[PDB]
Amino acid sequence: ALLQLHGIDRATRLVDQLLTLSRLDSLDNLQDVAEIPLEDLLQSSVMDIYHTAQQAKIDVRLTLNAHSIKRTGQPLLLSLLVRNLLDNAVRYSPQGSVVDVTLNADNFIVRDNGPLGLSIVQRIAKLHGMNVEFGNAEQGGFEAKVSWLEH
Amino acid sequence: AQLSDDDPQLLQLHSGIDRATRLVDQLLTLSRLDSLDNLQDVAEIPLEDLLQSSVMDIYHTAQQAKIDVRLTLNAHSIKRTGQPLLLSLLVRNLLDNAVRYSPQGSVVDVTLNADNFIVRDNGPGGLSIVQRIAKLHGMNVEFGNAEQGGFEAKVSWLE
Structure with missing residues (x-):
């Protein structure tokens, strides 16, 4: 459990631009790529x-x-x-x-x-081999769906 | 231990900076960024606040x-x-x-x-x-030993 102190929008914008300007395709050679438990990621x-x-x-x-x-x-x-x-x-x-x-x-x-x-x-998402589906939920409201190939 | 990093607002707070550093360092290099001219959110930075913060x-x-x-x-x-x-x-x-x-x-x-x-x-030492x-911001960084012993880092700019 590492800690990083900041807001989000400003961190996001910078990283987005750096990702775009690097024209990066895969995760293979990125620093700190690992097997992430999504349960812990979401909970965190x-x-x-x-x-x-x-x-x-x-x-x-x-x-x-x-x-x-x-x-x-x-x-x-x-x-x-x-x-x-x-x-x-x-x-x-x-x-x-x-x-x-x-x-x-x-x-x-x-x-x-x-x-x-x-x-x-x-x-x-695309970088991680994930698809993203936006849209309205069944019971109403906004719904973002991130999906991948089941292991 | 965990690969995950908490985003808010001793070893644990160095690790957070260490992971952000590694990623952004790599992305800076790959993007071969020359100047601040097109970077998002480039502004006049009050250095008192930055250091104090x-x-x-x-x-x-x-x-x-x-x-x-x-x-x-x-x-x-x-x-x-x-x-x-x-x-x-x-x-x-x-x-x-x-x-x-x-x-x-x-x-x-x-x-x-x-x-x-x-x-x-x-x-x-x-x-x-x-x-x-530093170089991206038109700044120089000099490392060395302190005038009375110990490590020293100095970030300089013009004007």
């Missing part, structure tokens, strides 16, 4: 915005439908991907609502109960 | 490890054109390095002058992102 991301959500009077639900799911990736870029989805979810979330975060065997879903920064999500 | 990130943790951090400000209203996150990384690397090779009970000196700042420890970020 929830912990980071927990207090922010509390003061915005928003709850964060973490549903773990699968366990032991591991993907090859750069933990910092992946954390940045998740953090942008959570920040977006919290931002457009009315008091008393729940931001829904679900870990499935081949995807994770970030869902809010509301009515760019999402372009880096797509860029980091 | 960096000291603030470190102070309490270093205190618990019996290391005192002294910030001296000889000049004020000093502004440089730069990218804030990169300058924050530069300063923090020099700081983490100075706290790391500092023996217990010693003092780390951070000094801001008109055309330079100095980070100085009392330790013995890897981090070349400092050189890279």
Whole structure:
């Protein structure tokens, strides 16, 4: 559990531009690429915005439908991907609502109960061999779906 | 131990900076970035705030490890054109390095002058992102031994 002190938008913008200007294709030779437990990545991301959500009077639900799911990736870029989805979810979330975060065997879903920064999500995902699906949820609200090939 | 890194707002707070450094250093090199001309969020940076803020990130943790951090400000209203996150990384690397090779009970000196700042420890007499970020900002970095013993890093610029 390493600590890094800062906001997110400014860190995101810089990293996005550095990724674009490097014209990087694969993760193979990136510093610190490892097998990331997505369970811990998602939980760690929830912990980071927990207090922010509390003061915005928003709850964060973490549903773990699968366990032991591991993907090859750069933990910092992946954390940045998740953090942008959570920040977006919290931002457009009315008091008393729940931001829904679900870990499935081949995807994770970030869902809010509301009515760019999402372009880096797509860029980091593609880099990680992940697809990103945006759209409206069944029970209403905005829904981001990051998916990969099931192991 | 864990590959994961907490993003907010002794070894654990050096590790965070270490991981961000490694990634951004690599990305800087691969992008072969020449100037600040097209970088996002390039602005006039007040160096007092940057140094004080960096000291603030470190102070309490270093205190618990019996290391005192002294910030001296000889000049004020000093502004440089730069990218804030990169300058924050530069300063923090020099700081983490100075706290790391500092023996217990010693003092780390951070000094801001008109055309330079100095980070100085009392330790013995890897981090070349400092050189890279500095060069990008039109700054020079000089390493060496302190006038009274210990390590010294000086970041200088013109005007």
